[PDB]
């Protein structure tokens, strides 16, 4: 759920 | 049209604001641009010794085009078709290759051993000491040479980005006559034509403003 890198997408529109 | 009128603008001194004009002459350029421009200008302004000034005399357009037309038929084998050739030899276990010779040390050795039929020397080589001795070596060894514009052009000849020198040593029987005719053409157009003028010092050119001042001073001296 939480980010690992500083730039993320995580795919929620 | 009664609704439109002519309203001329006075762009003289103490008048309406000046319009936008092309100010490219007054641009404060980046320092690297200024440095390369002033370096070229200084090379023009200074008196150039003959062994450097000889590199400003190159092959003309038509002769250079014919030379490169000959050499592109002997452009070397690329890495893609080398793998194809190496797989063909593995199944058998190949004819003799014909290619443009390149690489400065290799070409110098070929010239010293008198194997090079024709030598092409790029004029824009920095540092210039790498090729500044080549015309004299070719003349002493009796090898036909030609100074050409573009190490990038020679690089396209030899599948590289740049090339200081290219050399033709072995040619096919279908192109031996063309090579001989090209050698005679280069002898007529480059060796004989520029034999005297390559012995002179170059770069005796004044700037624009200094030239105008000298001409005005000469006119004032000769006529009142």
């Amino acid at each position: 759920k939480k980010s690992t890198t500083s730039w993320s997408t995580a795919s929620v529109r | 049209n009664p609704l439109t009128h002519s309203t001329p603008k006075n762009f003289g001194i103490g008048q309406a604001v000046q319009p936008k004009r092309n100010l490219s002459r007054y641009v404060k350029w980046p320092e690297y641009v200024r440095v390369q421009r002033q370096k070229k200008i200084l090379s023009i302004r200074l008196k150039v010794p003959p062994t450097i000034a000889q590199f400003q005399y190159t092959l003309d357009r038509n002769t250079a085009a014919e030379t490169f037309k000959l050499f592109n038929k002997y452009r070397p084998e690329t890495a893609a078709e080398k793998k194809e050739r190496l797989t063909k030899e593995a199944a058998a276990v190949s004819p003799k290759p014909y290619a443009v010779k390149y690489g400065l040390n290799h070409v110098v050795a070929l010239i010293e051993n008198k194997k090079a039929k024709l030598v092409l020397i790029a004029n824009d080589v920095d540092p210039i000491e790498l090729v500044v001795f080549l015309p004299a070596l070719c003349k002493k060894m009796g090898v036909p040479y030609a100074i050409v514009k573009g190490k990038a052009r020679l690089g396209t000849l030899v599948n590289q980005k740049t090339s200081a020198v290219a050399a033709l040593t072995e040619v096919r029987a279908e192109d031996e006559a063309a090579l001989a005719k090209l050698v005679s053409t280069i002898d007529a157009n480059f060796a004989d034509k520029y034999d005297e003028v390559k012995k002179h010092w170059g770069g005796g050119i004044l700037g624009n403003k200094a030239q105008a001042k000298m001409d005005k001073r000469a006119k004032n001296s000769d006529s009142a």
């Binding site: - | 103490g14 604001v17 000046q18």
Partner: protein, 213 residues
């Protein structure tokens, strides 16, 4: 020995100018195309007192020739300049008090002030109150002009150097006695820390070479 005040003043420190209340450096316009070839008209908006300077200053507003805006300049006021006056600066300006003209465009005997030492430095000579420069003569072949300075010296300068017609306002200031250490104190409070002065003989030999006895 020890360091005297003559040598201590060069370090700066407590000997720097007191410049809080100053109006700004008094200079001519930058020598641009308009002043090189024709003229330009500004307007005197106000005449103001400058702290630490005897002569009054004038605020003059010009129009920017390359952009729609106004440019403000601080001039040293010549005597007779008034608020609302039009001031003409350039090579084609007329010979009237307050106008800025090249030295080569004025006749002999012309009285100028705030004269450029070299063309472009925007005024260096005859700036104090009551002072002026006299145009002695011209040398057109060398494109030079001979002038007489307030000290009596004679100088040769470029004819493209500019000057303001007239004499600096506020003359006769030094003819009135101060009468009072307090008035001297208030005079130097707005200039710099160079007052009061102790005599070198009054000091000890370590403090000053003249000291002792």
């Amino acid at each position: 020995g020890r360091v005297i005040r003559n040598q201590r003043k060069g370090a700066g420190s407590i000997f720097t100018s007191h410049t809080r209340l100053r109006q700004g450096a008094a200079k001519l316009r930058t020598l641009d195309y308009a002043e090189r070839h024709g003229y330009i008209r500004g307007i005197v908006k106000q005449i103001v007192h400058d702290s630490g300077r005897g002569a009054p200053l004038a605020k003059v507003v010009f129009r920017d020739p390359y952009k729609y805006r106004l440019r403000e300049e601080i001039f040293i006021a010549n005597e007779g300049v008034h608020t609302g006056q039009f001031i003409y600066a350039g090579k084609k300006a007329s010979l009237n008090v307050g106008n800025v003209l090249p030295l080569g465009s004025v006749p002999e005997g012309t009285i100028v002030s705030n004269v450029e030492e070299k063309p472009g430095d925007r005024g260096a000579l005859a700036r104090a109150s009551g002072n002026y420069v006299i145009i002695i003569g011209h040398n057109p072949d060398e494109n030079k002009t001979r002038v007489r300075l307030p000290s009596g010296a004679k100088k040769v300068i470029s004819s493209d150097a500019r000057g303001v017609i007239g004499v600096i306002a506020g003359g006769g200031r030094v003819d009135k006695p101060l009468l009072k250490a307090g008035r001297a104190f208030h005079k130097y409070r707005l200039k710099r820390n160079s007052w009061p002065k102790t005599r070198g003989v009054a000091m000890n030999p370590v403090d000053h070479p003249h000291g002792g006895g």
